Amino acid sequence: MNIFEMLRIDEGLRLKIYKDTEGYYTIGIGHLLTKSPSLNAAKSELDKAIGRNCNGVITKDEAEKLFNQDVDAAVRGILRNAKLKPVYDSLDAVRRCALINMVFQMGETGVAGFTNSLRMLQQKRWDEAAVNLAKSRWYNQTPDRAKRVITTFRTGTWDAYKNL
Numbered sequence: 001m002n003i004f005e006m007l008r009i010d011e012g013l014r015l016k017i018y019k020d021t022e023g024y025y026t027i028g029i030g031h032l033l034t035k036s037p038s039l040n041a042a043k044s045e046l047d048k049a050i051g052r053n054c055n056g057v058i059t060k061d062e063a064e065k066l067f068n069q070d071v072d073a074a075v076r077g078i079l080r081n082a083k084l085k086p087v088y089d090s091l092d093a094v095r096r097c098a099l100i101n102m103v104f105q106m107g108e109t110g111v112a113g114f115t116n117s118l119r120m121l122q123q124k125r126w127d128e129a130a131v132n133l134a135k136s137r138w139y140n141q142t143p144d145r146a147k148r149v150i151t152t153f154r155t156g157t158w159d160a161y162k163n164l
Contacts, residue, residue, distance in 0.1 A: 001158045003071060003097045007104060009164050010145050013063060017042055017056045021142055028063035030104065031070060074104045083112040087122050095121070098152040105145075106138065121153060130154040 011030030017039070020026045025033045025042035033045040039056075046054050050062055078084045078099065088099055099121075102111045112118075114136070120129035130150050133139065139146040151160040 001161060003100055004067070006097055006101060006158075006161060007067075007071065009161055010101065010105075010148065013060075015058055015060070015063060017046065027058060027066075029067040029070075031063075031066045070104065071100070074100050077108040078103055081108050081112060083115075083118065084108065087118050090122050090124075092156055094156050094158060095153055098149050101149050101152075126154050126156075 008029060013029055014027065017025055017027050017033070020030075020032065024035050025039065025045075027033060027046060031049075033042045033049070036042070043054070043056050046056065046058070049066065050058060054062075078088050084099070084103070088096060091099065099111070114133070117129050117132045120132060130153060133150050133153065134146070136146075139150075148160040152158070
């Protein structure tokens with residue numbers, strides 16, 4: 001299993017504009033388009049992103065292209081971030097995928113706000129950190145997914161997705 005397969009399980013794939021759990025206009029594999037209420041603002045962002053008139057719909061290839069850009073930007077974001085990099089560097093390969101997953105969903109800033117949990121992951125206190133991560137809006141809003149990520153940080157294995 002790798003980061004792409006992981007995120008593909010958590011985000012799903014949709015070829016037509018859709019609303020995310022938060023109500024925002026998204027397309028493809030979790031690619032947020034705009035936080036704006038206008039479906040029109042959305043279609044405009046989409047066309048700007050693809051470089052064509054899509055009229056709210058894209059192909060598999062286009063979805064995958066946006067996906068590769070998003071994972072890349074998520075990784076580079078972590079590496080440029082002063083709160084995030086040290087933690088990333090301290091982790092093993094599977095747990096690294098869990099941090100990338102959070103950054104993809106909630107943005108760098110959002111994850112960097114989990115000060116205490118980051119400190120515990122760094123110190124390798126798996127159980128304590130899993131309990132702390134669960135005390136968040138994140139967990140309360142998207143629990144099935146948060147649980148999967150949390151177990152990944154907890155165990156360092158892919159058990160939570162070997163199911164799926």
